[PDB]
Amino acid sequence: LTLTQPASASATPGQRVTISCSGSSSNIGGNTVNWYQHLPGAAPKLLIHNNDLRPSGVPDRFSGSKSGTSASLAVSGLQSEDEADYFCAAWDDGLNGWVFGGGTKLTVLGQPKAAPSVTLFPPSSEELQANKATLVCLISDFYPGAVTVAWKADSSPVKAGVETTTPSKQSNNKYAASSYLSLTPEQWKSHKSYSCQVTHEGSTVEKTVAPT
Amino acid sequence: TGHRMAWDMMM
Amino acid sequence: VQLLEQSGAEVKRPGASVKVSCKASGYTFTSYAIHWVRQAPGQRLEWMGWINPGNGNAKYSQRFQGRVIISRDTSATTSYMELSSLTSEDTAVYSCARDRGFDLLTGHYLGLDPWGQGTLVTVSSASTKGPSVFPLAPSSGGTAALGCLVKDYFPEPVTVSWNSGALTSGVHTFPAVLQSSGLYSLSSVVTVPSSSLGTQTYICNVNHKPSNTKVDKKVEPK
Ligand SMILES: [Cl-]
């Protein structure tokens, strides 16, 4: 079954932030809530067990509470290292097993916006010789990690043959993504141009290439 | 079954 | 320190079965239950079942009953989860976790802790395929971007270096996209001085262990 958490939470350093978990009589109602921190590439770390108890090592700035069919994790004196995904867990009497919340991504506010760099490559002559054509739109150095990518043939929107990655963190803590438009050589050669258009925080960067 | 009862039976 | 160490990533065809292992250490294996859970891409954790490693008693979620078997080898302090009749819905990271159980003195629940690192299982009907590597010829100020498109390979992973590892400044290799064909593609790009383009050789080295393929693709100006 399901425990419900907000998709995200955010606050500035030093602030107090709370994350809620809602369930039913057959999980949170009757059993304890347990909370985990999840950092990239690492196994979940138990932060709170039995509603409100901290394991050894866990800073006292983490606390938990439960009331009726809901529960809350609070983090006070928020630090940048607290940026992570947090999820709740409880035994469910109907499942006779564990149920988990979908997790809440906690953002520690403060990093300024950064604009994307966009590079667009046309199909290589060798790929065209292999009877294929791929346009490659590479997007990097942007923050926050949310972008929209749109492609155009001449001036018209293209939806077919587009594949775009989900933005991923770079080592400089900005984000990157890539988008690919697959075409036949005939389509590539038949148009005046194709464009990759990247929108981020209400600003747009458009790059254009042409078979000419 | 509640969590403690279930855990008691299993273990 | 208590550890649960899991077996490596697996690729399976629809209809096959997979068996994932979880090696425990640092505590008395037979005294604590082991749970198995999974998480599909974009979805939440889902509990699959649990076992008392002392006696082998296993119990399962009704959603998996009849095609999951959880077992253990006490001499090897290892638990196994076998899932049969795989479909693409079974692509997920599979994780084990130790049940610390209840404190017999206080009645407090002590938590599932620690957890294993997870094992990715990918279920796909795609056949192993080495990539076609295409040069992305340089594009400019005092620097220029050039790269390689690593197209249509299966399964993951591919490794990419430039100039046999002698070039790292300004290298950016992007995460792969998974296409509707079930094949992956990725790109790697490097930023280099424009003044070097006439004289310096740039080669991307792509290795795809699963198809036993290596490509060294020279990238020239056009
Ligand atoms: Cl409980």
Automatic annotation (TrEMBL), chain B:
Q: Which domain of life is it from?
A: Viruses
Places the protein is found: Host cell membrane; Host cytoplasm, Host perinuclear region; Host endoplasmic reticulum membrane; Host lipid droplet
Q: What does this protein do?
A: Induces a specific membrane alteration that serves as a scaffold for the virus replication complex. This membrane alteration gives rise to the so-called ER-derived membranous web that contains the replication complex. NS4B self-interaction contributes to its function in membranous web formation. Promotes host TRIF protein degradation in a CASP8-dependent manner thereby inhibiting host TLR3-mediated interferon signaling. Disrupts the interaction between STING and TBK1 contributing to the inhibition of interferon signaling.
Question: How does it associate, per the subunit comment?
Answer: Homohexamer. Homoheptamer. Interacts with protease NS2. Interacts with NS3 serine protease; this interaction stabilizes the folding of NS3 serine protease. NS3-NS4A interaction is essential for NS3 activation and allows membrane anchorage of the latter. Interacts with non-structural protein 5A (via N-terminus). Part of the replication complex composed of NS2, NS3, NS4A, NS4B, NS5A and the RNA-directed RNA polymerase embedded in an ER-derived membranous web. Part of the viral assembly initiation complex composed of NS2, E1, E2, NS3, NS4A, NS5A and the mature core protein.
**Family to which the UniProt record says this protein belongs:** Belongs to the hepacivirus polyprotein family.
**The protein, known as:** Genome polyprotein
Part of the whole protein covered: 314 to 324 of 3033
